[PDB]
Amino acid sequence: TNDVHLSGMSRISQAVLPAGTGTDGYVVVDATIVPDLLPRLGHAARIFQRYAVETLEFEIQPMCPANTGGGYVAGFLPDPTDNDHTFDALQATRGAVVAKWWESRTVRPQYTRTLLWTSSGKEQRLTSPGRLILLCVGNNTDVVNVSVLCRWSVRLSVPSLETP
Amino acid sequence: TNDVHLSGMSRISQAVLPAGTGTDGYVVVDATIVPDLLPRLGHAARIFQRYAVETLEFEIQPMCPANTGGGYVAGFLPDPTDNDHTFDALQATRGAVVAKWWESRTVRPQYTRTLLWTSSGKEQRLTSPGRLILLCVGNNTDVVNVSVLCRWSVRLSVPSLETP
Amino acid sequence: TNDVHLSGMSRISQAVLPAGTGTDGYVVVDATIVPDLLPRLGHAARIFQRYAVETLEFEIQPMCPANTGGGYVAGFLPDPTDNDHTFDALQATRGAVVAKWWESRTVRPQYTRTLLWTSSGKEQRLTSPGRLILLCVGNNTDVVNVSVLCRWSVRLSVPSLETP
Amino acid sequence: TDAPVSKASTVTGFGRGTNDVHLSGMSRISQAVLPAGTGTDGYVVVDATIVPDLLPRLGHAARIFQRYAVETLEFEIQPMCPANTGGGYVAGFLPDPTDNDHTFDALQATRGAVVAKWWESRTVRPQYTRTLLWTSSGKEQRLTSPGRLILLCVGNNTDVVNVSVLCRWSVRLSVPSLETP
Amino acid sequence: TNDVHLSGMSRISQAVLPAGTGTDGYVVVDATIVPDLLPRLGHAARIFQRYAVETLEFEIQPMCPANTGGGYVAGFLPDPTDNDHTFDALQATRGAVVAKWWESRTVRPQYTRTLLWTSSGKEQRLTSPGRLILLCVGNNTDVVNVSVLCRWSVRLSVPSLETP
Amino acid sequence: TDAPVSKASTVTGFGRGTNDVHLSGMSRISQAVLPAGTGTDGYVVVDATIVPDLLPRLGHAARIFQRYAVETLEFEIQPMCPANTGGGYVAGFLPDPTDNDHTFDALQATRGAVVAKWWESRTVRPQYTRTLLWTSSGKEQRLTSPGRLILLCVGNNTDVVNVSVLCRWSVRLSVPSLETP
Numbered sequence A, B, C, E: 001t002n003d004v005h006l007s008g009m010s011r012i013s014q015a016v017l018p019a020g021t022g023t024d025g026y027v028v029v030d031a032t033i034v035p036d037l038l039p040r041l042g043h044a045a046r047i048f049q050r051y052a053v054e055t056l057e058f059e060i061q062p063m064c065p066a067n068t069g070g071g072y073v074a075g076f077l078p079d080p081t082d083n084d085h086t087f088d089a090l091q092a093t094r095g096a097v098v099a100k101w102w103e104s105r106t107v108r109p110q111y112t113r114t115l116l117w118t119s120s121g122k123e124q125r126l127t128s129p130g131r132l133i134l135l136c137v138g139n140n141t142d143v144v145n146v147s148v149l150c151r152w153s154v155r156l157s158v159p160s161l162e163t164p
Numbered sequence D, F: 001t002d003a004p005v006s007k008a009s010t011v012t013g014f015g016r017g018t019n020d021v022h023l024s025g026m027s028r029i030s031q032a033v034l035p036a037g038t039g040t041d042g043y044v045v046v047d048a049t050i051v052p053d054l055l056p057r058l059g060h061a062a063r064i065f066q067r068y069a070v071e072t073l074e075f076e077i078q079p080m081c082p083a084n085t086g087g088g089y090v091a092g093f094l095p096d097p098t099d100n101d102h103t104f105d106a107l108q109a110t111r112g113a114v115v116a117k118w119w120e121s122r123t124v125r126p127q128y129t130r131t132l133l134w135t136s137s138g139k140e141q142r143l144t145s146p147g148r149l150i151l152l153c154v155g156n157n158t159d160v161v162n163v164s165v166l167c168r169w170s171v172r173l174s175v176p177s178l179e180t181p
């Protein structure tokens, strides 16, 4: 059948937060989940027209010394159009996490499994499952290298050969 | 499926048409049906991302003396994008009613049952089932006070915390 | 049916504890669990009259370096009227935890599942499941940013449209 | 298969479009407003030749067909005015599109004609040909229109009168084509 | 088995043979069949390590006037390492065809069904099922434009992110 | 039948040669002569990589096929010397064509290895892959050869030793082609 099931785990974001610039509410990461953001899924969506996100998980992997103060709040807004970047908006989303800067965590988001479009278009809601937003909570004492990883699983349909 | 079913009746529109200003074709009520228009569904959509309209009925309840002249035509255009506001557009659609200003009527429209988005976006067809139009038929004689109510039932999904 | 089941996880409290001010017995957090304290539940209780707490958990997420001395005791008094803020009173409650300032923990409280009232009134016992109290144990060496999160699940009944 | 000088054309389904479409609907064929005193006896409130162009959806459907037959035709005189209005109306469907006789007697002579007061609604169930008519216009309009609906005042109207003339039509379209005005 | 089955038709070769240069035995098309040669299988092998050829057929579709002279012979050598490019080598193999320049033919070859490697290596026998050769038979009279297409079906395995 | 611009080609049986041929035989893969005293312990009497080229009829048959599978493979060490000869031999078939380990222990580790005196003949029944091998040569010889047969001296030979190493082979050839060196 045209449907092929792919899974993988890749880094959606890499950010560096210097010491003291991580004020409360600062936006460390704001990544709109698109197939191009994921390498293997990037090629897979380059050879397909439609994709549906069966499973989606995120892993916040901040690489900082244990003596680092402050923390982060990480969430997955299931609306690509939504631009709210406050603590309450993230915490309202299912699976959002709050953790110290030296404590890696996992986000298990909730979203609607609809058949999306691999290629971009006018309406972003038909192409992306949502956005991942990672904000600072409090103040960080050291420099934090944050890697945001995404464990994904998709179903691909309508074969084609697209261009970026 | 963590889908919340919510229902109730609420006033979508309140219009005061003064005597003599209700010429034929005058747009008394023009309301794109979005959850923010409904009072209780307003908060329900404020705490959710997606909604599906299971039941939708409109009740035109104009309050005026029985000796008033003229009438109204009310209809639900299933296309939110459509901007045609005339008697012809309303008569073409199904569920439309025409009645004297003292009469109370029910519009049972043809609406999409797909999963629409609570927030606003580039495409209105993904956010609203349609719009409701209430127009004058003839010329009124007394001051008309028309309230358009709606019995609605929705299914809500994808928790979040939206903003106005 | 009128009953709708909602769940979510949100921050009931955000506190900052400077270095040295966290003396033993100091009250870091004292939050009376009310629907307004939870954003999504805030809107949900704004569109309902009665609510019953089916599940209630709390997560103490203190964001401090590993070299921080002292700790905290966290508990959920199932009496909103009770004002005792001592170690023994918290420890007597079911699910109370004691932990180092750099060690996040979870409180699984015990409470009576009674149908409460979303809106406030004269008697606080008919509107709130209880209070969360977080006290210092010993002395803290560094500054601690404490986020108290609440994973809740409620059943809502008697639809209405309340005001704050 | 040998290589020929030219191969035969392989167009097969050409000239095989749908022939018959049954289209029904209801539309406002007229709307009139009468200020007090203007509606003297014999005043022509409504004069509408029933053609596919008069009915919008039927007009668009007739732009892609050659012939049409009126299976069902009924009219509603719906005057939206109070019961304190004096005067009345006579409504009738002349089966002759060409006849331009606008009198009470001419309308009353036709079958299904209605005489009512301005605060009473009526249904005109007329006599119309079932023969195939031409969707497009021509020299003789007796081949393209079933007739015309006429509405006159019977007496002087005391108040302002708002009258809407509606039509339930059912037609069968045939001989597919692509007409242009 | 997380094996992805992918299939489709794609042009492996495009050759423009000018009139008079198509002497007998001239190598119009010489293509070692690797996934990088195929457009869509190119990306598929870019996101996978190993592939197995389940279905393989070649379609010689030359576009030239019917009055042109000469012909072609097309054949699939199942050995990628073999460098013999003559009529004898093509006639020995199975699935080979010989036809006039205006005719369209299908080569149904004999190919290995083992698990080959998408990337290149020291041994070509572990990376490609073989090569396809299209040679002239006689001398052409008109300018010939020959496109060699391939209906292919593969099974892909061992996810990765390769480079050209 | 009309005259076309060009007629279709009528070549039908093209690319339909025989695919499978079972070929059996027996051939001398090696012959060695040892003067007295040269056959010290560990001396490599015979070192032959079993390939289609080593077997002449199989070589000619593999020049017209792409792949071959060894259905049967057995070896005979037949030393034609008297019983008064001292010393002995160890013979074994290494299933790895690439391995060039030439010792008593390496041979004895293999299945079917034989240790005999110079006046005794032995049959090596080895362990060989049944998978399809490539008739033609390539970069990696593990895809083209089942292995190599090795024959060493165990002790010093008192007299001259004439040893002939024979092989019974049965192969199935597949994927017809026309190979050239």
Ligand SMILES: [Ca+2]
Pocket: A048, A049, A117, A118, A119, A120, A162
């Ligand atoms: Ca696309």
Ligand SMILES: [Ca+2]
Pocket: A079, A082, B049, B118, B119, B162
């Ligand atoms: Ca939204």
Ligand SMILES: [Ca+2]
Pocket: C048, C049, C117, C118, C119, C120, C162
């Ligand atoms: Ca209340």
Ligand SMILES: [Ca+2]
Pocket: D065, D066, D135, D136, D177, D179
């Ligand atoms: Ca015509």
Ligand SMILES: [Ca+2]
Pocket: E049, E118, E119, E162
């Ligand atoms: Ca590789």
Ligand SMILES: [Ca+2]
Pocket: E079, E082, F065, F066, F135, F136, F177, F179
């Ligand atoms: Ca070969």
